Every structure is written in C-alpha cells, then in structure tokens.
Amino acid sequence: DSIIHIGAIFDESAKKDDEVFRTAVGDLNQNEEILQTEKITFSVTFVDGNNPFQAVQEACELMNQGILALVSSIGCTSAGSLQSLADAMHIPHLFIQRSTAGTPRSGCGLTRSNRNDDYTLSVRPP
Amino acid sequence: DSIIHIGAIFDESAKKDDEVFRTAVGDLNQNEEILQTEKITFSVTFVDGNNPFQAVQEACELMNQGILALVSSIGCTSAGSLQSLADAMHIPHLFIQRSTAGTPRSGCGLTRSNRNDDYTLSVRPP
Amino acid sequence: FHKKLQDRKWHSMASLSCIRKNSKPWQGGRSMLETIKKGGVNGLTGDLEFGENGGNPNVHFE
Amino acid sequence: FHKKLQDRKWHSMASLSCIRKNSKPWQGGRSMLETIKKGGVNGLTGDLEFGENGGNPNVHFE
C-alpha cells in the first residue's frame, strides 16, 4: 500500500526531466534513512506546453488520482494556468521553469493574482 | 423559448464592455429585420484577467449552460487559455483584446498550438 | 445566426463539460465558426469582417 | 513527507475534482506547503531551499 503519491506534468521536450524524475524516486525508495517504511509512487503526464487548457486538464486528472504535490517542468505559457490551478486546489506546486530551445531564461512575468495564497514554489533561482 | 444564447467573459476592468454588450443585444432584439422571430439571450461572467484558470473555469460554466459563441474582452494573460479551450470545445471565440491601463497594445505573441483548428476570431485589428 | 437559420443549417446549442471523461466538442461549432468568419457588418468601428487568418484587417489612424 | 510522517501531522491525499459544483481544495494542502517551503536539501544543484517569497535564492555563475 502506498500513501505517498506525487504527480508530474512535463512539456513534450522534457523527456530527460522524466528520466531523472523516475531515477530520483528510485534512489529515494532505496534510501532506508528517509521514509523508512514508505515507498514513493507517482503519475506522470506529458503535455503540449503551449496549450494551457491541456496543462490544466491533465494536472486536474492527476489531482483526481490523488497527489501530495505537483511537480512541473514547463515554459511560461502554461505556468500561469498551473499556478492558478494549484492555488485553487491547495496542491503544493514545485515549478521548474524550462527555457525554449536553450534560449536564456527571462522571468515569466505571469503576475499571478496575489489575493489568494500562493501554492507555487519556484525551484530554479531568479 | 430561446434558441439563441451567447456567453461573455469580461475582465474586472471591463464594466463598460458589459454595458455596451447588453445595449447591443437590446438594439438587435428591437430590430425586426435581423432574427425576425428570435430573441438573443446571454450569460455574462466577470473574471480576474490575470487568472487563466479562473477564465477557463468560468468559460466552461458558460459552455455547460449552452452557448453558440463566446465573446471575450480580456488581456493577453488569459487569452491563450481561452483560445485553447475554444479550440478543444469547438466554440466560436470572438476575442477583443484589452490593453492594460490604456497602455499601447502589443501583439499577444500567443504561439498558440496550430495542430488543431483555430476557433478564435480576433476582433480588433493587428 | 440569421443567415444560418435562413439557409436551414441550424445546429442546436449543447451543454458541454470541460475536463470530464466524455467531454466532447460542440457538433455545431465548425459550421458556426465558418459562418461567422465570412460575416461582415457596418458598425461603430466602420466595417467589421475577418480575413483568412481569422483577424479583422481594418484599421485607420489619424 | 518524512518530517510530516515523523511529527504525526499526516493528512491523507484526496481525490479532487476541477470545475465541478462541489470542487473543494485539499484540506492537507496548507500544512504540506508550509512543510515543503521550509525544507532544505543538499543535492545536484548544491543547496535547494526556498526564501519567504517561495523561490529558491541560490545561484552561482562562472
């Protein structure tokens, strides 16, 4: 029985992020010191990162399965929609900003509505 | 009985767009030459235009009521999410781009996914 | 809408659902979009119509 | 998650629904977010942690 389940939403260009995500879960599930009696399970979905409705829909399907946190590796286009969904549903959102085609990162500038509690944690530095 | 129902999604700053929208429906429903035997009815929802998930959710509620077309008056932040929703649901989307605080308009530079049919018609000129 | 009724090609509105197992698009949507896209009216902006790209082409600056 | 399970503050995951009449947030979410936010680990990037603003502060350029 697993009580520790996490969700992940990846851009279609982020196959290496999925490989490393699965390896990291593997490495932790072999660590006896952390989570001594509990294995981490997960559900991963790939989406078009230029389709914000698809990103919301698939993130919502992961939340229907039941998750403790949502990890995303995606560009700015769907980032605002995932952050606002995470705020509405109270799901901790670990956001890894991907740049397009190896271009230098700029801030997303999503200007997320600040009336509600922010459930997004930005994993990459400013 | 009414068979002509349209939906509208407005930014919170777009109270004048709602007033004119309602007046335009009024003027047409007094025109005997156009839609001779049918009145236009509507459902309007105001949203935070910086919350793309809220814009999608409320647009989806209007589609649940049943609409022939969706009119939006909103900025670029939620425009991509509404356009991708309209493409998924096959709902004609009449998009009126609002600028923020009377700033000169720039293109939304949406990079909206072109694999699917575009259900968005951009009402304001380039 | 007037043209679509006159041409006898009305498709009734449907109650749609987003993010559900059997979410399905509006079956009348493709024909409605094409009818709206080739529409044109004289209004408060001058002439409102759409080019092939789905955008209004008409603008004037003073 | 390890700290939440070793402090007897576990809240079970819930099946959530988006865009439904009785859509409701995860009741465990606020306490989980605060636990994650004040977490810190040594990893492949160096040190991963979050400031008050919810962002990782740590970066080095060569």
Side-chain angles (χ1 to χ4, degrees), chain A residues 49-93:
Chain A
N50 293 139
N51 192 327
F53 184 63
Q54 187 187 31
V56 169
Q57 179 185 295
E58 299 300 322
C60 287
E61 292 190 33
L62 298 177
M63 295 173 185
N64 189 260
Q65 171 64 46
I67 57 177
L68 294 166
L70 180 68
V71 179
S72 67
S73 200
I74 198 150
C76 295
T77 304
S78 287
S81 301
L82 293 179
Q83 291 184 33
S84 62
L85 174 63
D87 291 353
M89 300 313 303
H90 299 190
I91 292 289
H93 178 211

Short mmCIF file of all heavy atoms in Angstrom, two decimals, chain A residues 49-93:
data_model
loop_
_atom_site.label_atom_id
_atom_site.label_comp_id
_atom_site.label_asym_id
_atom_site.label_seq_id
_atom_site.Cartn_x
_atom_site.Cartn_y
_atom_site.Cartn_z
N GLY A 49 3.27 22.20 -23.97
CA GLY A 49 3.49 23.29 -23.05
C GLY A 49 3.05 24.63 -23.56
O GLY A 49 3.10 25.61 -22.83
N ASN A 50 2.58 24.70 -24.82
CA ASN A 50 1.94 25.86 -25.38
C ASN A 50 0.43 25.74 -25.34
O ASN A 50 -0.26 26.67 -25.75
CB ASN A 50 2.42 26.11 -26.84
CG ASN A 50 3.89 26.51 -26.90
OD1 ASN A 50 4.68 26.09 -27.75
ND2 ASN A 50 4.31 27.41 -25.98
N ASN A 51 -0.13 24.66 -24.77
CA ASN A 51 -1.56 24.55 -24.57
C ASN A 51 -1.91 24.65 -23.06
O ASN A 51 -1.83 23.65 -22.35
CB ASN A 51 -2.02 23.21 -25.19
CG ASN A 51 -3.53 23.12 -25.31
OD1 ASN A 51 -4.30 23.64 -24.49
ND2 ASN A 51 -4.00 22.41 -26.36
N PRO A 52 -2.33 25.81 -22.53
CA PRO A 52 -2.57 25.95 -21.10
C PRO A 52 -3.79 25.20 -20.62
O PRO A 52 -3.79 24.76 -19.47
CB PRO A 52 -2.67 27.47 -20.83
CG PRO A 52 -2.59 28.16 -22.21
CD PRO A 52 -2.01 27.10 -23.14
N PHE A 53 -4.83 25.05 -21.46
CA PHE A 53 -6.01 24.27 -21.12
C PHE A 53 -5.66 22.80 -20.97
O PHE A 53 -6.05 22.16 -19.99
CB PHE A 53 -7.16 24.49 -22.14
CG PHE A 53 -8.40 23.75 -21.69
CD1 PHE A 53 -9.05 24.09 -20.49
CD2 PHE A 53 -8.86 22.62 -22.39
CE1 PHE A 53 -10.14 23.35 -20.01
CE2 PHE A 53 -9.94 21.87 -21.93
CZ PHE A 53 -10.59 22.24 -20.74
N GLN A 54 -4.85 22.23 -21.89
CA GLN A 54 -4.39 20.85 -21.77
C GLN A 54 -3.56 20.64 -20.51
O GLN A 54 -3.74 19.64 -19.80
CB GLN A 54 -3.53 20.41 -22.97
CG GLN A 54 -3.19 18.90 -22.91
CD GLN A 54 -2.20 18.50 -23.99
OE1 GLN A 54 -1.36 19.30 -24.41
NE2 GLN A 54 -2.24 17.23 -24.45
N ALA A 55 -2.66 21.58 -20.16
CA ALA A 55 -1.89 21.52 -18.93
C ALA A 55 -2.75 21.50 -17.67
O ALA A 55 -2.52 20.69 -16.77
CB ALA A 55 -0.96 22.75 -18.87
N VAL A 56 -3.79 22.36 -17.60
CA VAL A 56 -4.79 22.36 -16.53
C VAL A 56 -5.58 21.08 -16.47
O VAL A 56 -5.72 20.49 -15.40
CB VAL A 56 -5.76 23.53 -16.67
CG1 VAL A 56 -6.98 23.44 -15.73
CG2 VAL A 56 -4.96 24.81 -16.36
N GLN A 57 -6.09 20.59 -17.62
CA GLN A 57 -6.89 19.37 -17.69
C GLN A 57 -6.13 18.16 -17.17
O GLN A 57 -6.61 17.46 -16.28
CB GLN A 57 -7.31 19.11 -19.16
CG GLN A 57 -8.13 17.81 -19.36
CD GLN A 57 -8.42 17.56 -20.83
OE1 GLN A 57 -9.13 18.33 -21.49
NE2 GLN A 57 -7.86 16.46 -21.39
N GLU A 58 -4.90 17.94 -17.65
CA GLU A 58 -4.07 16.83 -17.24
C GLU A 58 -3.59 16.92 -15.79
O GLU A 58 -3.55 15.94 -15.06
CB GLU A 58 -2.88 16.67 -18.22
CG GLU A 58 -3.31 16.37 -19.68
CD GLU A 58 -4.11 15.09 -19.82
OE1 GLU A 58 -3.77 14.11 -19.11
OE2 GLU A 58 -5.00 15.08 -20.71
N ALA A 59 -3.27 18.14 -15.30
CA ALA A 59 -2.98 18.37 -13.89
C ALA A 59 -4.17 18.06 -12.99
O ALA A 59 -4.02 17.44 -11.93
CB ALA A 59 -2.56 19.84 -13.68
N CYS A 60 -5.40 18.42 -13.42
CA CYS A 60 -6.65 18.05 -12.78
C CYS A 60 -6.92 16.55 -12.73
O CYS A 60 -7.38 16.05 -11.70
CB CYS A 60 -7.85 18.74 -13.47
SG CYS A 60 -7.87 20.49 -13.02
N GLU A 61 -6.61 15.79 -13.80
CA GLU A 61 -6.66 14.34 -13.79
C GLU A 61 -5.71 13.70 -12.78
O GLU A 61 -6.09 12.79 -12.03
CB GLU A 61 -6.38 13.77 -15.21
CG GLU A 61 -7.53 14.11 -16.19
CD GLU A 61 -7.45 13.38 -17.53
OE1 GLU A 61 -6.98 12.22 -17.54
OE2 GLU A 61 -8.03 13.94 -18.50
N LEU A 62 -4.48 14.22 -12.64
CA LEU A 62 -3.55 13.81 -11.58
C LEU A 62 -4.06 14.08 -10.17
O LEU A 62 -3.91 13.25 -9.27
CB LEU A 62 -2.18 14.51 -11.72
CG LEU A 62 -1.43 14.20 -13.03
CD1 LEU A 62 -0.12 15.01 -13.06
CD2 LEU A 62 -1.12 12.70 -13.19
N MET A 63 -4.71 15.23 -9.94
CA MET A 63 -5.36 15.57 -8.69
C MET A 63 -6.56 14.68 -8.35
O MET A 63 -6.82 14.40 -7.18
CB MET A 63 -5.78 17.05 -8.69
CG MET A 63 -4.59 18.03 -8.73
SD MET A 63 -5.12 19.75 -8.94
CE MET A 63 -3.46 20.45 -9.09
N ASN A 64 -7.32 14.21 -9.37
CA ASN A 64 -8.37 13.20 -9.25
C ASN A 64 -7.83 11.85 -8.81
O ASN A 64 -8.42 11.19 -7.95
CB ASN A 64 -9.16 13.11 -10.59
CG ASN A 64 -10.40 12.23 -10.45
OD1 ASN A 64 -10.41 11.06 -10.83
ND2 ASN A 64 -11.48 12.78 -9.86
N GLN A 65 -6.67 11.41 -9.32
CA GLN A 65 -5.99 10.22 -8.82
C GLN A 65 -5.60 10.34 -7.35
O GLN A 65 -5.68 9.38 -6.58
CB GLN A 65 -4.72 9.96 -9.68
CG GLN A 65 -3.76 8.86 -9.16
CD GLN A 65 -4.41 7.48 -9.15
OE1 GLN A 65 -5.06 7.07 -10.12
NE2 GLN A 65 -4.22 6.71 -8.06
N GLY A 66 -5.17 11.54 -6.93
CA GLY A 66 -4.80 11.87 -5.56
C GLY A 66 -3.31 12.03 -5.45
O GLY A 66 -2.56 11.07 -5.55
N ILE A 67 -2.84 13.27 -5.21
CA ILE A 67 -1.41 13.56 -5.13
C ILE A 67 -1.15 14.44 -3.93
O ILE A 67 -2.02 15.18 -3.47
CB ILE A 67 -0.85 14.25 -6.39
CG1 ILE A 67 -1.58 15.58 -6.75
CG2 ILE A 67 -0.88 13.22 -7.55
CD1 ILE A 67 -0.99 16.31 -7.96
N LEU A 68 0.08 14.37 -3.37
CA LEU A 68 0.52 15.23 -2.28
C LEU A 68 1.15 16.52 -2.77
O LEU A 68 1.20 17.52 -2.06
CB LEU A 68 1.65 14.54 -1.49
CG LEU A 68 1.21 13.28 -0.74
CD1 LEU A 68 2.44 12.50 -0.28
CD2 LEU A 68 0.31 13.61 0.47
N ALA A 69 1.66 16.51 -4.01
CA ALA A 69 2.32 17.65 -4.58
C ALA A 69 2.36 17.43 -6.07
O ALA A 69 2.29 16.30 -6.55
CB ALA A 69 3.77 17.82 -4.05
N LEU A 70 2.49 18.53 -6.83
CA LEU A 70 2.58 18.52 -8.26
C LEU A 70 3.93 19.10 -8.65
O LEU A 70 4.28 20.21 -8.26
CB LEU A 70 1.45 19.40 -8.87
CG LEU A 70 1.44 19.46 -10.41
CD1 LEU A 70 1.06 18.10 -11.03
CD2 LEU A 70 0.49 20.57 -10.90
N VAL A 71 4.72 18.36 -9.43
CA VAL A 71 5.98 18.85 -9.97
C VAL A 71 5.73 19.22 -11.42
O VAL A 71 5.09 18.49 -12.17
CB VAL A 71 7.08 17.79 -9.86
CG1 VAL A 71 8.40 18.32 -10.48
CG2 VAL A 71 7.28 17.46 -8.37
N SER A 72 6.19 20.40 -11.87
CA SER A 72 6.05 20.74 -13.28
C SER A 72 7.39 21.11 -13.85
O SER A 72 8.20 21.76 -13.21
CB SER A 72 4.99 21.83 -13.59
OG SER A 72 5.33 23.11 -13.07
N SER A 73 7.66 20.69 -15.11
CA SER A 73 8.82 21.20 -15.83
C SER A 73 8.30 21.68 -17.16
O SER A 73 7.94 20.90 -18.03
CB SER A 73 9.97 20.17 -16.00
OG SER A 73 11.22 20.79 -16.29
N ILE A 74 8.19 23.02 -17.31
CA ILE A 74 7.38 23.59 -18.38
C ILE A 74 7.78 25.03 -18.59
O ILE A 74 8.42 25.64 -17.73
CB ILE A 74 5.87 23.44 -18.07
CG1 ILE A 74 4.96 23.61 -19.31
CG2 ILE A 74 5.43 24.33 -16.87
CD1 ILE A 74 3.67 22.79 -19.17
N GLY A 75 7.47 25.62 -19.76
CA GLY A 75 7.70 27.04 -20.02
C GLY A 75 6.65 27.94 -19.42
O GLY A 75 5.69 27.51 -18.79
N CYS A 76 6.80 29.26 -19.64
CA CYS A 76 5.96 30.30 -19.06
C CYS A 76 4.52 30.31 -19.53
O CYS A 76 3.64 30.73 -18.78
CB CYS A 76 6.56 31.70 -19.30
SG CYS A 76 8.15 31.91 -18.44
N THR A 77 4.24 29.82 -20.76
CA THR A 77 2.92 29.84 -21.41
C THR A 77 1.84 29.16 -20.61
O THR A 77 0.73 29.67 -20.47
CB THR A 77 2.96 29.16 -22.78
OG1 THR A 77 3.95 29.79 -23.57
CG2 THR A 77 1.61 29.28 -23.53
N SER A 78 2.15 27.99 -20.02
CA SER A 78 1.20 27.24 -19.21
C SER A 78 1.48 27.36 -17.74
O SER A 78 0.71 26.86 -16.93
CB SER A 78 1.25 25.73 -19.53
OG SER A 78 0.66 25.51 -20.80
N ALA A 79 2.58 28.04 -17.35
CA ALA A 79 2.96 28.20 -15.96
C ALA A 79 1.90 28.93 -15.16
O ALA A 79 1.52 28.48 -14.08
CB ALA A 79 4.33 28.92 -15.85
N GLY A 80 1.33 30.03 -15.70
CA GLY A 80 0.32 30.83 -15.00
C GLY A 80 -0.96 30.11 -14.70
O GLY A 80 -1.52 30.26 -13.62
N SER A 81 -1.41 29.28 -15.65
CA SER A 81 -2.56 28.41 -15.53
C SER A 81 -2.39 27.29 -14.52
O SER A 81 -3.30 26.97 -13.76
CB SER A 81 -2.92 27.78 -16.89
OG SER A 81 -3.20 28.80 -17.83
N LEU A 82 -1.21 26.64 -14.48
CA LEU A 82 -0.90 25.66 -13.45
C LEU A 82 -0.79 26.23 -12.05
O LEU A 82 -1.30 25.65 -11.10
CB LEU A 82 0.39 24.87 -13.75
CG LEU A 82 0.29 23.95 -14.97
CD1 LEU A 82 1.64 23.25 -15.18
CD2 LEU A 82 -0.83 22.90 -14.82
N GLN A 83 -0.14 27.41 -11.90
CA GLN A 83 -0.03 28.11 -10.63
C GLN A 83 -1.39 28.51 -10.08
O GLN A 83 -1.71 28.23 -8.93
CB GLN A 83 0.86 29.37 -10.80
CG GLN A 83 2.34 29.01 -11.07
CD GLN A 83 3.23 30.24 -11.14
OE1 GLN A 83 3.03 31.26 -10.46
NE2 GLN A 83 4.28 30.18 -11.99
N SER A 84 -2.28 29.09 -10.91
CA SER A 84 -3.63 29.43 -10.50
C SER A 84 -4.51 28.23 -10.16
O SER A 84 -5.31 28.28 -9.23
CB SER A 84 -4.37 30.35 -11.52
OG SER A 84 -4.53 29.71 -12.79
N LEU A 85 -4.37 27.10 -10.90
CA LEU A 85 -4.99 25.84 -10.53
C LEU A 85 -4.52 25.30 -9.18
O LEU A 85 -5.32 24.90 -8.34
CB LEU A 85 -4.69 24.76 -11.61
CG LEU A 85 -5.17 23.33 -11.25
CD1 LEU A 85 -6.70 23.26 -11.09
CD2 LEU A 85 -4.65 22.30 -12.26
N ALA A 86 -3.19 25.32 -8.91
CA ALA A 86 -2.62 24.88 -7.66
C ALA A 86 -3.11 25.69 -6.46
O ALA A 86 -3.46 25.11 -5.43
CB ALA A 86 -1.08 24.95 -7.75
N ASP A 87 -3.21 27.03 -6.62
CA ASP A 87 -3.80 27.95 -5.66
C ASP A 87 -5.26 27.65 -5.35
O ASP A 87 -5.68 27.68 -4.19
CB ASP A 87 -3.74 29.41 -6.17
CG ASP A 87 -2.33 29.94 -6.21
OD1 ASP A 87 -1.38 29.28 -5.74
OD2 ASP A 87 -2.20 31.10 -6.69
N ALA A 88 -6.09 27.35 -6.37
CA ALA A 88 -7.48 26.96 -6.20
C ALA A 88 -7.68 25.64 -5.47
O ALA A 88 -8.61 25.48 -4.68
CB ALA A 88 -8.19 26.90 -7.57
N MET A 89 -6.81 24.64 -5.72
CA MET A 89 -6.99 23.29 -5.21
C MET A 89 -6.17 22.99 -3.97
O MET A 89 -6.28 21.91 -3.39
CB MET A 89 -6.58 22.27 -6.30
CG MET A 89 -7.43 22.40 -7.59
SD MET A 89 -9.24 22.50 -7.36
CE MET A 89 -9.42 20.94 -6.45
N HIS A 90 -5.32 23.94 -3.53
CA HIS A 90 -4.40 23.80 -2.41
C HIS A 90 -3.40 22.67 -2.60
O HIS A 90 -3.07 21.95 -1.67
CB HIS A 90 -5.08 23.71 -1.02
CG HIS A 90 -5.90 24.90 -0.67
ND1 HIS A 90 -6.37 25.00 0.62
CD2 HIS A 90 -6.33 25.97 -1.41
CE1 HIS A 90 -7.07 26.13 0.65
NE2 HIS A 90 -7.07 26.73 -0.56
N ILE A 91 -2.85 22.51 -3.82
CA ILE A 91 -1.91 21.44 -4.10
C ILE A 91 -0.55 22.11 -4.18
O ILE A 91 -0.39 22.97 -5.03
CB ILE A 91 -2.21 20.69 -5.39
CG1 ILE A 91 -3.53 19.87 -5.24
CG2 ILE A 91 -1.03 19.77 -5.82
CD1 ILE A 91 -3.42 18.66 -4.29
N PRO A 92 0.45 21.79 -3.35
CA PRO A 92 1.81 22.32 -3.49
C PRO A 92 2.41 22.10 -4.87
O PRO A 92 2.47 20.97 -5.34
CB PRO A 92 2.61 21.60 -2.38
CG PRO A 92 1.55 21.24 -1.33
CD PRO A 92 0.31 20.95 -2.17
N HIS A 93 2.85 23.18 -5.53
CA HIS A 93 3.27 23.14 -6.90
C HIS A 93 4.75 23.47 -6.97
O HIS A 93 5.19 24.56 -6.65
CB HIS A 93 2.42 24.13 -7.73
CG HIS A 93 2.79 24.22 -9.16
ND1 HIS A 93 2.64 25.40 -9.84
CD2 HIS A 93 3.31 23.27 -9.98
CE1 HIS A 93 3.07 25.17 -11.06
NE2 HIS A 93 3.49 23.90 -11.17
#
